[PDB]
């Protein structure tokens, strides 16, 4: 049960199972399923090889898994290089998107030390 690199859960329903792939969430999974011609309810158990192949192909059509990671990462790197406000934020480990830092930055800040 491999698709676009990584393994997919054998028991889980396709819509959800697909979501395991980095670069597909729910909507994209659904789209993929539609493209294939498969229902959402079916599992990877009771799913044919030919059927799988089509799905895989569909997935390939999107920028997914390692490629996506490479892209996003690259963007971040570029930003950092630029030294744009966003870049600066990224470098510091502070909220990029314009949040308060006085309090509640703990995701990007990390778990508080003192």
């Amino acid at each position: 049960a491999r698709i676009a690199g990584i393994n997919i859960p054998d028991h889980k329903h396709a819509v959800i199972a697909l979501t395991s792939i980095y670069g597909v969430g729910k909507t994209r999974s659904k789209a993929i399923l539609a493209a294939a011609g498969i229902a959402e309810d079916v599992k990877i158990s009771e799913l044919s090889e030919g059927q799988i192949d089509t799905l895989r192909d569909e997935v390939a059509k999107f920028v997914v898994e390692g490629d996506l990671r490479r892209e996003i990462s690259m963007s971040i790197k570029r930003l950092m290089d630029l030294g744009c406000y966003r870049g600066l934020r990224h470098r510091r480990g502070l909220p990029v998107r314009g949040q308060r830092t006085k309090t509640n930055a703990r995701t990007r800040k990390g778990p508080r030390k003192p």
């Binding site: 290089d81 630029l82 744009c84 406000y85 600066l88």
Partner: protein, 82 residues
């Protein structure tokens, strides 16, 4: 951000100044306050001194800085550490 129908914003004065600079090709960093202005392709190569409230931080305009606003490369707050 800004709508695609509305067209990417640039401060008029800076646009004019930039044009002049490009026309001449004379270098010499442009004093700018309008930080709210998308950098253009024509702005690449120039140095623009973007205001940060206090001073005009000189940003050498690279090819990668285009769709960004000027103020992005011109940090206003001067924080180091606690």
């Amino acid at each position: 951000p800004r709508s695609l129908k509305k067209g990417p914003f640039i401060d008029l004065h800076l646009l004019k100044k930039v044009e002049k600079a490009v026309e001449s090709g004379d270098k010499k960093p442009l004093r700018t306050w309008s930080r709210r202005s998308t950098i253009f392709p024509n702005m690449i190569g120039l140095t623009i001194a973007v205001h940060n409230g206090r001073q005009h931080v000189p940003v050498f305009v690279t090819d990668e800085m285009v769709g960004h606003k000027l103020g992005e490369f011109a940090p206003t707050r001067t924080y180091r550490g606690h």
